[model samples]
Target: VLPQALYLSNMRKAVKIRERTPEDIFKPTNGIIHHFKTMHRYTLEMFRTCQFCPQFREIIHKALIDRNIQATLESQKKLNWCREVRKLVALKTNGDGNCLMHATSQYMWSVQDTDLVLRKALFSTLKETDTRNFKFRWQLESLKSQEFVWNDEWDNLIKMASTDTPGLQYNSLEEIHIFVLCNILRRPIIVISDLKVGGIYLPLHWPAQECYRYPIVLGYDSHHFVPLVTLKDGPEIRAVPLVNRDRGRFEDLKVHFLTDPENEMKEKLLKEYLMVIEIPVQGWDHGTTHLINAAKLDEANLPKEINLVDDYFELVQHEYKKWQ
Candidate 1:
């Protein structure tokens, strides 16, 4: 009874969307390679090192279960009924590598690589619910005035950093560095402070932590400099090499802060960010909540097909042509 042409046209549109799916998009390149590399550098370190210790595994496990439940629930399917449910259960108990992806994996369509899925999922949910909430109130009100509750292990880490150790001491990893940076920047100005090699160390009160890099601020001439510096170096010190900004914008700063390795340092910060703080909000409390707000934003209704491979390849290519 339907017109043949109209039926064919609708089918074609469906096919087109499938072609554009993120999985198909990301499948051709070494995008998975990057995923594995990133997961190794960031997520694996926490488990292998046992930094968070006995509770780390439990914390991560609980987070994954919660995330899987949320994802299944949001889909209007019972948690036990989902196909991925078995895979997720196996991942949690099997200790192989199934539960490796972080919480936001669902929001990212399981494209992102990390073991911190609970935190990610929580954040993705929070961001989806409300963005103006944190920016409008809590970050300024709660964070600025309150004293953080530190545990004994954290205190020991601080002590170790302050005193000399046989090895590199407190900053053996990149997460610590980024956590300190987040503490300094707070909620609003999410700038990525790329610390140049040999920059002076700025220690926080938490002795074990310090910022080894400097923040970059762009000038009218397209040159950049570090905005926060001591009088010995002048208030404006041109210390760290700014992360390259090809098609730069304010929001991209946050991405650079989380994903980049120090230009000359070989130290990747995102892993460290995961270890010491939740990957999504960097270090802010209720960071997971905030991310949930962002994830829930109406635009986040990711068409089930926008594969990471395609999106990333296109993104990289677009980035490459900018200097051309």
Candidate 2:
């Protein structure tokens, strides 16, 4: 239902945010650090999702900065951008809707554009002194007719444009760069199947608890850290960091989901004939390295003999209802 995480890499490059060692930089600790990280993922996911939808192009891009504060307030209460931003990213709002509906019904939960309003509201939330010191940057460009590219690289161009100015503090610079690891190294993935009317394909978003844990690049924010996934309820998003299932290390788990042909068939159906793979991480640690761990995924490739749609539906129907 979401794009691949590779898109995160593109955003980082666009913004000119590069990876830097945490030891060298003065990283914030406690809650603020966590908040910043959350924002980073939010930024990346938003940028990627907005790239695919056409209707929200202008609003998504224009919303990158702290602009349209007054306009956002004028929109309908449910359609209000202010309350939605705090609810999804900052974890500060108590709105009763979810981002899924907002995404499909409204702006597709375009995070970058959404953050444009969030930034303004957040700035408003700050003290007068703190507000004066804030510097905001965001982008949403319609690179294609039905798609936009929230070019993080574009952010870099903007950064250079402002380099001549002094006293401008660029906060969250390192956090922004984390997109590189996510996008370039672990790239986000989205696959659309060509299944026709009668084609048998697995559907995602089923009511299985295990399915919810799958890595999907649901959305991101201006900070470009935690990736958003399907929300439980309300017009909001859920935060998911990179994680590895540790299948390669143990021979028995070489292919947790792909090992069994039956499981592979089930997965293919769930992805609706398209499977999404993400850069695996150790546990849910946002920063885990598997330097020496390596394996070939060739064996995991599905067999060609299976009739995707026909067999999958047959299997499901057989399990749910006795043979006719």
Candidate 3:
């Protein structure tokens, strides 16, 4: 499993994050732009599974000039500093091979030793799905036509879901239980995995219209599922990588995930259990990285755009010495 997503509003007054409208000053230098272009190829190689939109290619080109890059540049000490950044930290889970359910239990009902409950739930869900009650086969037919999923993904997941043992293997894909857990909650499950492009994931049966004020987040590192929580200056922790589901809307919305206002109840509940820690962030930075690929004005060059990173997106590769 993965770590948690932080709601920006929960912190103190200085923590108030009011993002801007492109700042009208982005268009990073030609060199920085080059770094971004090269990264696009890397992402494509990394996440060929993603279905990106053509609209974003040009947006990606014009994305280099960032507000954070300039303003934060002034504060040499705070550049890449973890202070202003809020992040999701991973909590410990017993590597029972049942880590997914272990994380799921704490996320949903805050229950322990209840992975067994989720395991059973998954068995039932897969049985219903495999039996055609969910009509998953019909959907698979459509996906197969597009070659979107692996041929044996369904059967393998079905077999894995029905396993009687406590420990699951590393070969198992998070996709199997990810779908089942989302169903178990009837809520979106935001999974943070070691995905090449966007680490964040949502259910295939996602609710677009309904507001997902807070989705349970899990950290799936390798095959282990670790429970996650938001941390402020929490030590030894890195900023959580984040991205929204909508590629087209990436331009219009602020990239950082924030805690919705008036959700004091949810905030209160999390504070009661979610631990805050310190760590260096290896995750995505909305203030800096989201601009790597925005949308373009012309679709003619679309093939070039959808395709894109450095670990920190290599604006540093150009190292803005005098390129302002």
Candidate 4:
């Protein structure tokens, strides 16, 4: 426990406490007692006025939820499933406000790009898939699920994704656009994250709502994402994540299609690159389809158990030591 009382110096009585300059007030000992006195008075006030206040209780309640916001414990959960079930390893990305999008570019085409690119790409998809223009059997389900309307939710994501908009680059949520990228990429995105549930984030955009053939698998931490792939830069089957009513229908139909390259001719509309038809070229699209052409698909960047990796705690200690 800290000392119960603030001690005054012997010189306090000598000159009836000579002028306390700013520097004098901050010379460690004086500052400690100075602040402590204010702190003690505040503590007394709290005891008198806040013992049972709703404001006090609510503040603590919110802090508790904020601390455990992941709900699944990111540290242990982020590293476990990839190592045990997926037979893959968690790789690294630059720590920045754009980490989530950076990881997406890596897995989307196996090369990292500026966060601005994916943000803009997502904004484009939001407009392209606008409920007014695109007629589908069902609209995407936001994390709102059923508690709220998405007219506002959709607009928020569209707004957040704009280059003109700033701040929130280290964004907390991506549930809405997760499915948007699924259709744009034309491959189901399998995400393994600290989230309690992991699976193919389906947007249900196609006419047949086909689960398709090639799916991109991803790994996630608090505000970041990483791709989990085989040594050959592909994904696994039985070890993936699952959920929802749509999952049941897709899983049943999925087993029948995994064995056929003949089926790819039909699924090529879903492929990211290299198409040819009328002039021995069916035409191509950039950013979405073209980028995958240069991806390192033949090999993957993989790592296993190692010591050099760190979480927030290690970095904090490292920073703390550097200053002293």
List, residue by residue over 1-324, the lDDT tens digit for candidate 4: 111111111223212212211122211332111111110010000011123255543442242112232334234443222222233433345445555565555443333335255555556655543444222211422232467533565466566555562544444336545655555443455665543235444324443233333456566656666555443212332233231113212121111112134234523432322121111111122222111111112122212111111122233234435534
Per-candidate TM vs. native?
0.17, 0.19, 0.40, 0.42
Candidate 2 weakest lDDT stretch, 10 residues: 191-200
Residue-level lDDT of model 1, residues 282-305, one tens digit each, is: 223334222111100011223324
Local accuracy by lDDT, each model: 0.24, 0.24, 0.35, 0.36
Q: RMSD of each candidate?
A: 23.6, 22.7, 22.1, 22.6
Tell me which residue pairs clash in candidate 4: 276-282, 277-281, 277-282
The TM-score measured for candidate 1 stands at 0.17
Q: In terms of TM-score, which candidate is strongest?
A: 4
Worst 10 residues of 1 by lDDT: 40-49
lDDT of 4: 0.36
Give model 4's clash tally.
3
| Candidate achieving the largest lDDT | 4
Estimate candidate 3's RMSD in Å.
22.1
Q: Model 2, 287: alpha-carbon shift in Å? A: 14
